[PDB]
Amino acid sequence: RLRTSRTKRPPDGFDEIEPTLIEFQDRMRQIENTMGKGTKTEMLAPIFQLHHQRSRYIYDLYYKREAISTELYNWLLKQNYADGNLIAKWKKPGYEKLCCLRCIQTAESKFGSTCICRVPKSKLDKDQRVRCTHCGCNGCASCD
């Protein structure tokens, strides 16, 4: 993950996108330091937020604007700058706007069911449109 001055030089298309990744890292640090205003699980929601956003940025670089070479993209996934499993989920129908990967797997729930965010809002009542407790998600379903 961490790169030294004497490490192998990343592929060519890296430097122009290096600064924004640096900004992502900076704010992740700030979120780590920032404390208060939530329950034991709510304070850990913004982490997944930024993480999904960062992975989506890389996904947008490759699959929507073809701004990065395939070599650089494999390098980025190998350096954990993006979550390979989350991107794999984004590449199949029904999970285009997946929030995180803990809201899809059923072994982490009380009754073996996915999260509320995975459910389309059309069949969900108006009153029970609440923030996810896993990551604060406000609706994953591809329809919305």
Partner: protein, 109 residues
């Protein structure tokens, strides 16, 4: 655990008694637990889930008195259309500090 297979027409099974007046409503019902009867049943997950889903939706509709919708295939998308238009747009990643900053599934209302 009736061990003998027996035809139908002798299944009336009458109590054959004066049917005691003295029993009250709290004794009219047979039970295992103090509150009522409970016994095993092999329901597959999906059917129990979807029917419970429908009953919960019906209860919410009865409570809020707001039941003015239909159901179809294209109707699902049509219902989703207005909830989508009420929602603010999701920003574009790499726009990151205000003025169209990216917010995806976390976008509010």
């Amino acid at each position: 655990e009736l061990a003998r297979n027996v035809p139908v027409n002798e299944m009336v099974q009458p109590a054959l008694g004066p049917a005691n007046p003295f029993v009250t409503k709290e004794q009219d019902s047979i039970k295992n637990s103090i509150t009522g009867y409970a016994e095993r049943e092999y329901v597959p997950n999906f059917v129990f889930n979807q029917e419970y889903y429908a009953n919960t939706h019906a209860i919410y509709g009865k409570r809020n008195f707001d039941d003015n919708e239909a159901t179809t295939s294209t109707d699902l998308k049509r219902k989703s259309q207005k909830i989508k238009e009420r929602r603010e747009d999701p920003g574009d990643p790499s726009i990151l500090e205000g003025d169209g900053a990216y917010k995806g599934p976390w976008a509010g209302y």
